Coordinates of C-alpha atoms in Angstrom, one line a residue:
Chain A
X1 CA 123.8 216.2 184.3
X2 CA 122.0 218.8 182.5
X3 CA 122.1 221.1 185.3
X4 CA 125.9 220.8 185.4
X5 CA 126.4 223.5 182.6
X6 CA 125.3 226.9 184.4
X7 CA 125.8 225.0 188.3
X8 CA 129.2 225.8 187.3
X9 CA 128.8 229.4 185.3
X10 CA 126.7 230.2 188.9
X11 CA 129.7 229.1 191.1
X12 CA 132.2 231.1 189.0
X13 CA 130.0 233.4 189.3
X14 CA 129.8 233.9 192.9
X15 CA 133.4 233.6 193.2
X16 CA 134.6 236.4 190.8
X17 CA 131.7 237.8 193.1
X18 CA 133.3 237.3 196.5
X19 CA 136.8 237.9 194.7
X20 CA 135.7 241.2 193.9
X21 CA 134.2 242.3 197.1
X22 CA 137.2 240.8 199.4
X23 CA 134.6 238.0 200.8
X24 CA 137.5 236.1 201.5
X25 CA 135.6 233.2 203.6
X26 CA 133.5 233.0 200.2
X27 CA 136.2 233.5 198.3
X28 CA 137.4 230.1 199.5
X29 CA 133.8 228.7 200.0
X30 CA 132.7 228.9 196.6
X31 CA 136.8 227.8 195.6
X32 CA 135.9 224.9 197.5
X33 CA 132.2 224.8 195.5
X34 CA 133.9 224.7 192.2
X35 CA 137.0 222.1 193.0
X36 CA 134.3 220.2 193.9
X37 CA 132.5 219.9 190.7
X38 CA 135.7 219.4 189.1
X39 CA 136.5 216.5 190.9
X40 CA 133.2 215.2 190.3
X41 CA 133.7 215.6 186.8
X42 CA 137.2 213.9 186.7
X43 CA 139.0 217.2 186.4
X44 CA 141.6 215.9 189.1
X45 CA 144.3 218.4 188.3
X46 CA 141.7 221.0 187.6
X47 CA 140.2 219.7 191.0
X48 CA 143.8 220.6 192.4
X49 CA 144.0 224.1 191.1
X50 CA 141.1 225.8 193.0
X51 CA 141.2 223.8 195.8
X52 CA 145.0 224.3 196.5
X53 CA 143.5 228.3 195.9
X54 CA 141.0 227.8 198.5
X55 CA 143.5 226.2 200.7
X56 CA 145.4 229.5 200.9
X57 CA 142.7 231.6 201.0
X58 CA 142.4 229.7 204.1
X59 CA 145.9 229.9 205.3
X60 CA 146.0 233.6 204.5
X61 CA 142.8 235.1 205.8
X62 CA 140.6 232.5 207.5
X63 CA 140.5 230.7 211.1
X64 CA 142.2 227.5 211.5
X65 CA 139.2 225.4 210.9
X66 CA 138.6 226.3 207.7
X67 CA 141.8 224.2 206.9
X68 CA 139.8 220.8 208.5
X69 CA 137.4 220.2 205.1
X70 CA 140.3 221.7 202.9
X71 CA 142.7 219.2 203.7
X72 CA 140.2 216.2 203.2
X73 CA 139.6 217.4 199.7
X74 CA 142.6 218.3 198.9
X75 CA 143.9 214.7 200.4
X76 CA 141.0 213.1 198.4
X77 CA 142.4 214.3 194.9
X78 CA 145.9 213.8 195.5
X79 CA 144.5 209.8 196.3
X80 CA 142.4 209.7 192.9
X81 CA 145.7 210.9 191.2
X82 CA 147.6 208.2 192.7
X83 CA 149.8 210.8 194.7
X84 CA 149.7 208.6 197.8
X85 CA 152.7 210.5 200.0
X86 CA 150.8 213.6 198.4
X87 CA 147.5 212.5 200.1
X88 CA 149.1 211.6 203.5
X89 CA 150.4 214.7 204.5
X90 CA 146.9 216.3 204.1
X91 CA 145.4 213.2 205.0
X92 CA 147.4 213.2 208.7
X93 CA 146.8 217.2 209.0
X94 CA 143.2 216.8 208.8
X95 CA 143.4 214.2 211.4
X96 CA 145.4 216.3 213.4
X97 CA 142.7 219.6 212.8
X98 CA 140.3 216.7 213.8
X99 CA 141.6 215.8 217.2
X100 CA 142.6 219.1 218.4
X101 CA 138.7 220.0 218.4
X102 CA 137.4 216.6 219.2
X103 CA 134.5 216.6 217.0
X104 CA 134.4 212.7 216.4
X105 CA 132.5 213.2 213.2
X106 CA 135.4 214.9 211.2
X107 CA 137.6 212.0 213.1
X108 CA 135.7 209.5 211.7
X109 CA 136.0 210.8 208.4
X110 CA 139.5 211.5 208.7
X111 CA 140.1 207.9 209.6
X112 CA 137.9 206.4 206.9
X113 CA 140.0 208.3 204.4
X114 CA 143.4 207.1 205.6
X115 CA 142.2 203.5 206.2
X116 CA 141.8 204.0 202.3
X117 CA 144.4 205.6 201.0
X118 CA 146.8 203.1 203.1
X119 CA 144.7 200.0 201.7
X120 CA 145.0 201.5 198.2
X121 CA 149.1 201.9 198.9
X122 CA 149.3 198.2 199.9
X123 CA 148.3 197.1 196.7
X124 CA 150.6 198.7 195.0
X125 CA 153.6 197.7 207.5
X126 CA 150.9 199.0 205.0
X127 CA 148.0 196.6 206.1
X128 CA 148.8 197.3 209.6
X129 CA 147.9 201.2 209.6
X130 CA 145.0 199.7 207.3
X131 CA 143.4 197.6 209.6
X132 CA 143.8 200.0 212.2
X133 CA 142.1 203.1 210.5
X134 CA 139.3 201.3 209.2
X135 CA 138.9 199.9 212.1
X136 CA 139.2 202.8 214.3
X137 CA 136.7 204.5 211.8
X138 CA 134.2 201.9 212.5
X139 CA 134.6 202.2 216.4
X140 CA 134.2 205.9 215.8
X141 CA 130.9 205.3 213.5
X142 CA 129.3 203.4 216.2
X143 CA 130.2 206.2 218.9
X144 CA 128.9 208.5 216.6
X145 CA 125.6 206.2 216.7
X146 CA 118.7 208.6 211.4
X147 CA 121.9 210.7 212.0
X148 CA 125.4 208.8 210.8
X149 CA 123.8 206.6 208.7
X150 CA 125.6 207.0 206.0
X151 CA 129.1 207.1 207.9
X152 CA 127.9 203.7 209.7
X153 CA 127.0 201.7 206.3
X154 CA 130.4 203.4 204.2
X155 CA 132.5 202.0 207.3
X156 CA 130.3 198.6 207.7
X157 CA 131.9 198.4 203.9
X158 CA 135.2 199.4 203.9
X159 CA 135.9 196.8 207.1
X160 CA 134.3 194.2 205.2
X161 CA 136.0 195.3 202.1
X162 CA 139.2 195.1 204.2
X163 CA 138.6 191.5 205.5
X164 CA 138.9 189.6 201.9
X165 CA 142.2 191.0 200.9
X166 CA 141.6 186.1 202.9
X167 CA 138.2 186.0 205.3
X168 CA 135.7 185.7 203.1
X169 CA 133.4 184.7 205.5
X170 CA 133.2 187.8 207.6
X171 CA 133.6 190.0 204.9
X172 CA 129.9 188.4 203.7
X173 CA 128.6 188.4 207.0
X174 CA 129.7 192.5 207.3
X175 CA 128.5 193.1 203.4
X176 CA 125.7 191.6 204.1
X177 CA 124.6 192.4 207.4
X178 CA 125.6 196.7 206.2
X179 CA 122.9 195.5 203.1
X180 CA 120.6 194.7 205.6
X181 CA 121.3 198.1 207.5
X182 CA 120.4 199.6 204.1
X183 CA 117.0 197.8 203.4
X184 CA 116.3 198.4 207.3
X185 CA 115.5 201.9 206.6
X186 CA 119.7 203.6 194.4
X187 CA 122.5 204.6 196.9
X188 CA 125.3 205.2 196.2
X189 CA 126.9 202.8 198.9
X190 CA 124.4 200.3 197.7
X191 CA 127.0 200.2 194.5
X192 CA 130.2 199.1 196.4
X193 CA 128.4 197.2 198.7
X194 CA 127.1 194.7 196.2
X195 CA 130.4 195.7 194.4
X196 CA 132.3 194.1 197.3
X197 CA 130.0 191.4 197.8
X198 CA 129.8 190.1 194.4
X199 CA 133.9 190.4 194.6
X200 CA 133.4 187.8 197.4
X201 CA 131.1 185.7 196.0
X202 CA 133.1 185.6 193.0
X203 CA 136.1 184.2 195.2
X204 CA 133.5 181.8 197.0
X205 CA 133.3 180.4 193.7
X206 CA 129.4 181.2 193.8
X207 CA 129.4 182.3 190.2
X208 CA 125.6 183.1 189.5
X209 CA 125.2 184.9 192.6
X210 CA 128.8 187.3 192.6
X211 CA 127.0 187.7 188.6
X212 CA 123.7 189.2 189.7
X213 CA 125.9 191.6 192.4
X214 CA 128.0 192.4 190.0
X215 CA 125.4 193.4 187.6
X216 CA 123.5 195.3 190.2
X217 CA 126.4 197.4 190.8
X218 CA 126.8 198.2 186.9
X219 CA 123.1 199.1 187.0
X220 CA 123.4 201.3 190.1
X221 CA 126.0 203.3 188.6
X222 CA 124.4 203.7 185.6
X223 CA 121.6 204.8 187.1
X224 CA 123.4 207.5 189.6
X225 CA 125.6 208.2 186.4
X226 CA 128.8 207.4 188.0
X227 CA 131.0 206.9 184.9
X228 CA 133.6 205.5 186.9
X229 CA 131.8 203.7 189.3
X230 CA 130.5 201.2 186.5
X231 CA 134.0 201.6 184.6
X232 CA 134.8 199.3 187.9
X233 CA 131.6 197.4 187.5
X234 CA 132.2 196.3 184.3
X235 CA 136.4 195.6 184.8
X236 CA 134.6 193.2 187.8
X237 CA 132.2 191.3 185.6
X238 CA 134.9 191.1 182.9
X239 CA 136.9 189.1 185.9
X240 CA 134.2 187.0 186.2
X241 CA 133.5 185.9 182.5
X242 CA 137.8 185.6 182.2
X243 CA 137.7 183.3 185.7
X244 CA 135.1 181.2 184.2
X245 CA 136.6 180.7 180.6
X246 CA 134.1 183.2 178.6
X247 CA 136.8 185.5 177.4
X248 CA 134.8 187.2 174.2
X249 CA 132.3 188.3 177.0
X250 CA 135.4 189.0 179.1
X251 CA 136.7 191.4 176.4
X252 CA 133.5 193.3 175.7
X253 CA 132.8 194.0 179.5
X254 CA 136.6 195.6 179.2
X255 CA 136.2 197.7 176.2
X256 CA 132.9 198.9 177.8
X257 CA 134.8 200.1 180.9
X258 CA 137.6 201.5 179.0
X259 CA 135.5 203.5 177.2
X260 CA 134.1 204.7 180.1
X261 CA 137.1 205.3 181.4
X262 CA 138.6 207.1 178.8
X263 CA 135.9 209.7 178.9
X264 CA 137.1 211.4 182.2
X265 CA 140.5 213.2 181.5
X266 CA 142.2 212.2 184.6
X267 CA 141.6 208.3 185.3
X268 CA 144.3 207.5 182.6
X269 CA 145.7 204.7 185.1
X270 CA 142.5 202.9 185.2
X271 CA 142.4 202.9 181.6
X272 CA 145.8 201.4 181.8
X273 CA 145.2 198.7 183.4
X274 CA 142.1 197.9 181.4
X275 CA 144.1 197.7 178.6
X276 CA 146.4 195.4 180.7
X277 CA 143.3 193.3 181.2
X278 CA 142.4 193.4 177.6
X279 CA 145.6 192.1 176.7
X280 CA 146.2 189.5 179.3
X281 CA 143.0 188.0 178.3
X282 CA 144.0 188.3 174.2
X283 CA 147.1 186.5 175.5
X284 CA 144.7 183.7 177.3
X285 CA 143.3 182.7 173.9
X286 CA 146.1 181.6 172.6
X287 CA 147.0 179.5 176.1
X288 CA 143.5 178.2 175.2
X289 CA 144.3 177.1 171.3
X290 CA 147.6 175.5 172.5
X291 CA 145.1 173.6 175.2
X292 CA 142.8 172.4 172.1
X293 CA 145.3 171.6 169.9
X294 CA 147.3 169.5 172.6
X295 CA 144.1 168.0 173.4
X296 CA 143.7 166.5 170.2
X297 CA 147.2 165.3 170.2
X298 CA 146.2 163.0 173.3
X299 CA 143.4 161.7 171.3
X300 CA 145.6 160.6 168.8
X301 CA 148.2 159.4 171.7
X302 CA 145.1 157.3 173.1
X303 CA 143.9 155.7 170.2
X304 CA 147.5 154.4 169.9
X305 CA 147.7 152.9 173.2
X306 CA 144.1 151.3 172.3
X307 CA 146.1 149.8 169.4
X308 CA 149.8 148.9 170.6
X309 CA 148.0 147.3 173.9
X310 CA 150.6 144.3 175.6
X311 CA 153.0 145.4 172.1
X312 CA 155.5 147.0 175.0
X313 CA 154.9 150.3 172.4
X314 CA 151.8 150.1 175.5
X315 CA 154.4 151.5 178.2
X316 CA 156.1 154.0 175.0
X317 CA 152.6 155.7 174.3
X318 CA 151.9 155.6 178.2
X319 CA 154.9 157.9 178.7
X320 CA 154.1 159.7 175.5
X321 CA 150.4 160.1 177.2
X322 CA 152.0 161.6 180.6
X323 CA 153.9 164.0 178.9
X324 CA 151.5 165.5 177.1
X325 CA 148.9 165.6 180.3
X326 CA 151.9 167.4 181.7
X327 CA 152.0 170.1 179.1
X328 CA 148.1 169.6 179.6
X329 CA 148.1 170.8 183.3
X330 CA 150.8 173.3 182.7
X331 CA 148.7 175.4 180.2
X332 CA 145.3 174.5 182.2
X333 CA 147.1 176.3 185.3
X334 CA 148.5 179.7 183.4
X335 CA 144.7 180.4 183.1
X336 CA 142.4 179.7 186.0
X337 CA 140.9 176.7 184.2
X338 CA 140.6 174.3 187.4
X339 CA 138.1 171.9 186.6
X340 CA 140.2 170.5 183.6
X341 CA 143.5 170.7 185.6
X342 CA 141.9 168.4 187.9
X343 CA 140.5 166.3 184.5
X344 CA 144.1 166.4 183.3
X345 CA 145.8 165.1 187.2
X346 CA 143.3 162.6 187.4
X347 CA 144.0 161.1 184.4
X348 CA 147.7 161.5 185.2
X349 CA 147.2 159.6 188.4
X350 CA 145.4 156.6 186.4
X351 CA 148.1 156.2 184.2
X352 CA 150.9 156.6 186.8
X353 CA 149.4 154.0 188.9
X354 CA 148.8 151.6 185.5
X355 CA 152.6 152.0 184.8
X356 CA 153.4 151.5 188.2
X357 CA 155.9 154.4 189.1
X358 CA 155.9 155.9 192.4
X359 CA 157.4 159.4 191.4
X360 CA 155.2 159.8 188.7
X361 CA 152.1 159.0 191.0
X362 CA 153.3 161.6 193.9
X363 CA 153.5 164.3 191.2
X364 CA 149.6 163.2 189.9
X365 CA 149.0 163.6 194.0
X366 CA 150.7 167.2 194.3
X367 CA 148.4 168.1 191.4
X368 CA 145.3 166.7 191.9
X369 CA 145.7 168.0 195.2
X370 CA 146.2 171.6 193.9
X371 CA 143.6 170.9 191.5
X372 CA 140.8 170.5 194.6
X373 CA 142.5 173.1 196.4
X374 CA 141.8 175.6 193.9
X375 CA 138.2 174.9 193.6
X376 CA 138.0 175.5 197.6
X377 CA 137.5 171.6 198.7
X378 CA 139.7 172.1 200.9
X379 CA 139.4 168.8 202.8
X380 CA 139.3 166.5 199.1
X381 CA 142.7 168.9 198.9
X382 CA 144.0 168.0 202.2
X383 CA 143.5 164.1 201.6
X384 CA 145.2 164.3 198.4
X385 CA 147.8 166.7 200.3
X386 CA 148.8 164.2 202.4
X387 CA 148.5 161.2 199.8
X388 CA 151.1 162.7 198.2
X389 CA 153.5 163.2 201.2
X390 CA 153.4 160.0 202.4
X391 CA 154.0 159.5 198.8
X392 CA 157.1 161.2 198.5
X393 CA 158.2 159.9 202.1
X394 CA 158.0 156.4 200.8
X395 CA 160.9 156.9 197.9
X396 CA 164.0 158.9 198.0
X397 CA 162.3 162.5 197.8
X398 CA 162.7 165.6 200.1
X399 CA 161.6 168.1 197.6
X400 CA 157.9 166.6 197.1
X401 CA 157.2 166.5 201.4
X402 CA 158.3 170.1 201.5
X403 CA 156.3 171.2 198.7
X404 CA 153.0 169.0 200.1
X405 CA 153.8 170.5 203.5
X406 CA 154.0 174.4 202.2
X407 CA 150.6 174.2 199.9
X408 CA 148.9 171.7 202.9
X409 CA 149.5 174.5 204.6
X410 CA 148.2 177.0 202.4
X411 CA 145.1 174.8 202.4
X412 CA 145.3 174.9 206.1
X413 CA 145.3 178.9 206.1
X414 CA 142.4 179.5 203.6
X415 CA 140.8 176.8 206.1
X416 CA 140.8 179.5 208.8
X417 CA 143.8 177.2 210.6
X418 CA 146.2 180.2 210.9
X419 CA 148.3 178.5 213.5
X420 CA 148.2 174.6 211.3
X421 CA 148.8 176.8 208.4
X422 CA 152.2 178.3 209.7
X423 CA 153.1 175.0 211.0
X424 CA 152.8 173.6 208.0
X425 CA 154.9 176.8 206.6
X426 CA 157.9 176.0 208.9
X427 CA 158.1 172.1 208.6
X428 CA 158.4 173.1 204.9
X429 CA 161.0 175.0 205.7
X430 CA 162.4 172.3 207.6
X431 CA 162.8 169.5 205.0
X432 CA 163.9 172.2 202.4
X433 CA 166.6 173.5 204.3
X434 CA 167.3 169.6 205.0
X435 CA 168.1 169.4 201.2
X436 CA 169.6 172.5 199.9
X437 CA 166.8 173.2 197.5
X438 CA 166.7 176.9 197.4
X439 CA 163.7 177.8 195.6
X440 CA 161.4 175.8 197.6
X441 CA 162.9 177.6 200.7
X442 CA 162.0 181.0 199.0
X443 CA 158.5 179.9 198.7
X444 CA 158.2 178.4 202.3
X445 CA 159.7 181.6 203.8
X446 CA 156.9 183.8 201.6
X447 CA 154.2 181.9 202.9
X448 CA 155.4 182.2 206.1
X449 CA 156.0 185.9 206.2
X450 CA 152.4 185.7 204.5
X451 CA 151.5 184.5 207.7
X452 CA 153.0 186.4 210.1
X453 CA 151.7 189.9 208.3
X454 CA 148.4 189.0 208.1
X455 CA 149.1 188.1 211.6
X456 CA 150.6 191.5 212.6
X457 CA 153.9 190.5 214.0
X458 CA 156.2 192.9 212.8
X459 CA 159.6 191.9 214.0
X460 CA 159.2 188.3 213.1
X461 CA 158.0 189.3 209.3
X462 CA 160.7 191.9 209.1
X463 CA 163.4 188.9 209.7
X464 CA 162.1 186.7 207.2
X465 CA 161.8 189.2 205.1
X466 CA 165.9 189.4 205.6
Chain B
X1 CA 149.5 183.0 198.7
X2 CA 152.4 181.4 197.0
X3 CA 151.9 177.4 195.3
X4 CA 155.8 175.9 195.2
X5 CA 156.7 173.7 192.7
X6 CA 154.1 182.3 183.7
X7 CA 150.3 182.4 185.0
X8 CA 147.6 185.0 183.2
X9 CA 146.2 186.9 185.7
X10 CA 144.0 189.5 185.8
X11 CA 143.2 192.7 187.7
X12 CA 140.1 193.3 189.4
X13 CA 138.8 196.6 191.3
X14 CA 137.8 197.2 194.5
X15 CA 135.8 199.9 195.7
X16 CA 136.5 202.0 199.0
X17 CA 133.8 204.5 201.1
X18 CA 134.6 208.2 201.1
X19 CA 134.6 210.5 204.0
X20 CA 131.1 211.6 204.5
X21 CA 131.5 215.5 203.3
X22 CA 134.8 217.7 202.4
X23 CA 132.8 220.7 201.0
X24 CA 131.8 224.0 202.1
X25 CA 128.6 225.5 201.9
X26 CA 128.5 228.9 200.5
X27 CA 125.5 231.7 201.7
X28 CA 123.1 233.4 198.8

């Protein structure tokens, strides 16, 4: 970045240059130049300035196809800004410039760039215009297939980026197979292809491996110099040191992006939310001392019961041993601790079935079965899923079968059995509109309108949604 | 999705593929 000093004094140059010799087509070309430089400098509303100038530069004096790159830019800055109705309307004219000539290459991109900024909306009928600009950008980079290589590998990504947010598995076969691509033939798309994949390791549960993408990634963009690029890197590998209870680590990847982040004068939102992360994990540490201090509480509650055995004070510090594996698995379950929530509902379950109590025991079920269901052993899940509703069946209990049916289902869906999965969804529904429990019908219609979006069945969602 | 029955949860990043060129190339 050396060279970024007189790059720019040289580009100012030319344009007072073609500003003083009416050059109007490089008055606007060398605009264009210079917004550029700001934007790759995280001058966003700098960015804005000269290329809203070379926009009407444009407008004023220049053919219509000038306007096609203009509006990508323009659309591109307004996105990094989070000015998301901003970016559309640029966004859609520059598809619009794009079809009128039916060049396919500047369709492509135009696609691959409202693919994005609708996926970056979503997270914030949304998914549907996703899917079907990344999608039609893909179709649009094979067509266009040494020559679209670039365009080919960046779509290969975004579709597999597009699968996770719940198919993992073809989101790793696409990040892996665009990898592939890559090695077939230091890149940038390199970074957010490992980015992506370590993203879905990381939610595979595959720890080590979503580390060492991760970390190539960080490397990458430290390499290209991409501030933000590794200010993403690192918020990623903070995720995985806060999923995996290593929050001091957690909190110096997240000071590392955040001053990363604070070095570019226009990413103030991502600096945001790294503070949010920084604080959500500050807040985690406490969770954590109230776990360790409650944990010592049940060794003192157990080496009671060791003492008061056949005393009938065995059944009092059995009940005083539930509840405090109940405020266990509560604060186990506020952080993403799974393997001692499924510690805590095991125990639960062995002391349930020692003091012989059936509602106690379902409720050990519906958590040891959430326990496995979390970790992603989905069928251990299920058989403890349906444990626990034949469970609840047995005694006078409606709510427990409706909640076992909803999560079986979500086991179901995450299982890749969509159609189980909203089956599952509606026979909750059944059994808690059955018992005029209103909360677990809220949760049974969300999952189910879960279903149906991902499914893209707008009518249907749109009722439930009523 | 949604588990029925205050949880600390983090926000990750994701990272999207620009369109392949938007600038313009000057003569000199």
């Amino acid at each position: 970045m050396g060279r970024d000093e007189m790059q720019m004094s040289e580009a100012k140059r030319a344009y007072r240059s073609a500003k003083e010799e009416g050059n109007r087509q490089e008055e606007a070309r060398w605009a264009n130049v210079i917004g550029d430089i700001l934007k790759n400098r995280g001058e966003y509303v700098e960015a804005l300035k000269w290329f809203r100038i070379d926009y009407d530069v444009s407008v004023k004096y220049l053919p219509e196809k000038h306007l096609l790159p203009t509006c990508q830019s323009l659309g591109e800055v307004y996105l990094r800004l989070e000015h998301f109705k901003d970016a559309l309307i640029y966004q859609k004219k520059h598809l619009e410039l794009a079809k009128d000539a039916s060049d396919l290459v500047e369709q492509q991109r135009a696609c691959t760039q409202l693919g994005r900024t609708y996926y970056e909306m979503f997270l914030r009928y949304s998914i549907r215009n996703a899917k079907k600009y990344f999608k039609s950008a893909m179709k649009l980079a094979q067509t266009l297939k040494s020559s679209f290589l670039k365009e080919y590998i960046d779509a290969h990504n975004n579709i597999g980026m597009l699968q996770m947010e719940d198919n993992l598995e073809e989101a790793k076969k696409l990040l892996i197979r665009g990898l592939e691509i890559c090695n077939e033939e230091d890149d940038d798309g390199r970074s957010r292809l490992h980015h992506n994949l370590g993203n879905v390791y990381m939610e595979l549960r595959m720890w080590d491996k979503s580390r060492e993408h991760i970390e190539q990634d960080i490397i990458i963009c430290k390499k290209i110099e991409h501030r933000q690029g590794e200010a993403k890197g690192y918020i990623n590998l903070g995720e995985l040191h806060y999923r995996v209870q290593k929050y001091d680590e957690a909190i110096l990847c997240y000071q590392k992006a955040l001053n990363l982040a604070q070095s570019m004068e226009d990413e103030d939102a991502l600096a945001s939310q790294i503070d949010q992360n920084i604080e959500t994990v500050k807040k985690a540490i406490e969770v954590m001392d109230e776990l360790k201090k409650e944990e010592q509480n049940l060794k003192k509650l157990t080496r009671n019961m060791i003492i008061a055995k056949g005393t009938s004070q065995e059944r009092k510090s059995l009940l005083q041993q539930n509840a405090s594996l109940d405020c266990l698995i509560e604060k186990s379950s506020m952080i993403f601790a799974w393997l001692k929530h499924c510690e805590y509902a095991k125990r639960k379950k062995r002391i349930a079935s020692e003091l012989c109590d059936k509602g106690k025991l379902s409720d050990s079920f519906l958590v040891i079965g959430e326990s496995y269901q979390k970790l992603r052993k989905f069928n251990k899940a299920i058989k403890w899923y349906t444990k626990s509703w034949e469970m609840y069946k047995s005694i006078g209990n409606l709510e427990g079968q409706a909640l076992a049916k909803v999560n079986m289902g979500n086991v179901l869906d995450s299982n890749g059995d969509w159609a189980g999965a909203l089956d599952a969804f509606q026979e909750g529904y059944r059994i808690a509109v059955e018992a005029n429990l209103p909360s677990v019908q809220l949760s049974a219609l969300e999952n189910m309108h879960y279903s149906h979006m991902i499914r893209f069945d707008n009518i249907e969602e749109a009722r439930r949604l009523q | 999705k949604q588990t029925a029955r205050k949880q600390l949860a983090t926000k990750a990043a994701r990272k999207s593929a620009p369109a392949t060129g938007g600038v313009k190339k000057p003569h000199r």
